[PDB]
Amino acid sequence: VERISLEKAALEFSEANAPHPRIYELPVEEGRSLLNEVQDSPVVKEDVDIEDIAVDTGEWGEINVRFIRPLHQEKKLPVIFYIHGAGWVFGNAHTHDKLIRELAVRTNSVVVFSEYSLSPEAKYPTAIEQNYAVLQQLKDFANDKKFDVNHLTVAGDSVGGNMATVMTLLTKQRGGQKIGQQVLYYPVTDANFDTDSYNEFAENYFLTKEGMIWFWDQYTTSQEERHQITASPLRATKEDLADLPAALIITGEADVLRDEGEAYARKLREADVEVTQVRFQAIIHDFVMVNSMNETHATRAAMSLSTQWINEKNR
Amino acid sequence: VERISLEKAALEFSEANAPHPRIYELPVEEGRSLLNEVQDSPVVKEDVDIEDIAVDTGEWGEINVRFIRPLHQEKKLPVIFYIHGAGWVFGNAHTHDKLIRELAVRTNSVVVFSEYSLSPEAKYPTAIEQNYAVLQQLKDFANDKKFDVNHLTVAGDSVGGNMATVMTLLTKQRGGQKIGQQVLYYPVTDANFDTDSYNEFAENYFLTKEGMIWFWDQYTTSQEERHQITASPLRATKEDLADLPAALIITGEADVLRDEGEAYARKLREADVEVTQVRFQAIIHDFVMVNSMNETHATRAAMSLSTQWINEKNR
Ligand SMILES: [Cl-]
């Protein structure tokens, strides 16, 4: 099979995910299991205290929220609100465990991780409403969980990066809990399947054009919903994006979502938002989450850049 | 006229250098003055101990070699050999002052900065042999200057990056002083003017196609010499590149040199060399050196990544 230059682990993850049936061609409960089994593979995880709290989002129901804290910290820590990815269909505290532990320890922060309702059982805009409601209840936990809600970062990977930047939109529109800055790992920004990266990396790079069409189909099949800026933030006007929190936007070269991530970065920059946009060569979608890609140069450099950038923000 | 999305400081520096005559249309002496003047503009510089030594390169004559040291450091520090850019025609310890002080402090390293002979007065291969000569003498200054030669990083910007990576090939060919790793900021890697980035960014982004044609003409007009892997390292075979030191290669989006930098990273990775390749969006050539670009998101992210990458190496 013909591919561009990739890190060994990215090539191996691409080859391992080429055979049919792929993850998005399984009954959604078997897909969810397969990602869990993928994320059982060997990795060194930083050390944290974990607390699972049921949080009531009101109209949008009760979800588990996981609170993660580095060991032996007496002081009031900054807080990171982390929204997981994996296509609105998969993922949980276990799939993203290595990533959020690394963020907690290297930024010396509490990580708050919403287990939002998954598609297709939950449709747009349930996940974004539940995530926005948890953000409004962070002040309610700030004292018992020893974090400072005035040192607030929102972050997410893929579909989670989509909802993370959408948290900044909803907050500006509804005057909610101030967000200092946002970190989007290889986000979804648009329900369009015709960008040059979508065309070039359509097949053979683990995340496929066909799979992304399916993920959007699980989230909502309404064109009117997909055109809302809280589904496709790439569609935001200059006036919509003005005064949003400072953003770090990380892309990989061999990713269908590369161009829409880089395009969204240019739109924020044109709206005078502070933007740090970096593309890592020779790497595929999902590289800061997947355990087997934990050692890639892209992963090591992405985590060094992201943790440092947040550390600089908090002080 | 019109440019892709750029950071404010990159746009301003592009416009300032739009009108004729440009720096490469001046006599070489006014060229050198213009760049010295540009680097008089105000910027925060870290504090350091500085020391100008004459070093004898044998055949290629005696050159000034600057040692930079972070204040109040009672240990043997790691060392970085830094080869400056600016087209082989310009640059000196003044033009690169801000950058080498930041590298010294944030890596807690001595910075050894060879003031190699400039072109056209000197031709290929003088500058690379002088730089190579100083490398083999580092073990001899190691004690007065308290550094450990077994924690040796070579680094360079643009033609400095060219000559830095060429130091690693000469070292391998000759059994010279072992280099741990190499940092290339937007390197020159090939005497070809026909890459997609050369065409797209040929004009309006400060560094022009015509500018690079002239810089190469000052260095050597010989097509035979340009085909040499010690002039155009992109032309190296897999066998030439095998076992070279671990590489960090940084590129800017809005840079004629972007593609040949990215292409050289692929060739190193295909030769099983450890490569960290990162492209920063919306930034022009020279962004880690030029004082007026010191606060760009690109410059801050490139300094944070490259300094942490070097620190992790020195363990
Ligand atoms: Cl299918």
Author numbering:
A (entry chain A), B (entry chain B): 2 to 316
What does the paper behind this entry write?
In this study, we performed an in-depth biochemical and structural characterization of a novel microbial acetylesterase, LgEstI, from the bacterial fish pathogen Lactococcus garvieae. LgEstI belongs to the HSL family of α/β-hydrolases and presents a clear substrate preference for a short acyl chain and an acetate moiety that are suitable for the narrow entrance to the active site. Monomeric LgEstI exhibits a canonical α/β hydrolase fold with conserved key active site residues. The active site of LgEstI has the typical catalytic triad of esterases, identified as Ser159, Asp256, and His286, and is located at the bottom of the substrate access channel.
The three-dimensional structure of LgEstI was determined using X-ray crystallography at 2.0 Å resolution. An LgEstI crystal contained three monomers per asymmetric unit. Superposition analysis revealed that each monomer was almost identical, with a root-mean-square deviation (RMSD) of ~ 0.3 Å (Cα), including most of the water molecules surrounding the monomers. The monomer can be divided into two domains: a CAP domain and an α/β hydrolase domain. The CAP domain is made up of three triangular helices, α1, α2, and α8, whereas the α/β hydrolase domain consists of a 90-degree twisted β sheet in the center, five neighboring α-helices (α3, α4, α6, α10, and α11), and turns connecting helices and strands. Careful investigation of the active site of wild-type LgEstI indicated that two of the three monomers had a triangular blob at the tip of the hydroxyl group of Ser159. The crystallization condition included 0.1 M calcium acetate hydrate; therefore, we incorporated acetate into the blob as it had a 0.5 reasonable density fit value. The acetate moiety was positioned at the bottom of the active site and surrounded by Val160, Met213, His286, and Asp287 within hydrogen bonding distances, and an oxyanion hole consisting of Ala87 and Gly88. The oxygen atom interacts with the NE2 of His286, and the methyl group of acetate is directed toward Val160 for hydrophobic interactions. Unlike other esterases, LgEstI contains bulky residues such as Trp89, Phe194, and Trp217, which block the acyl chain channel.
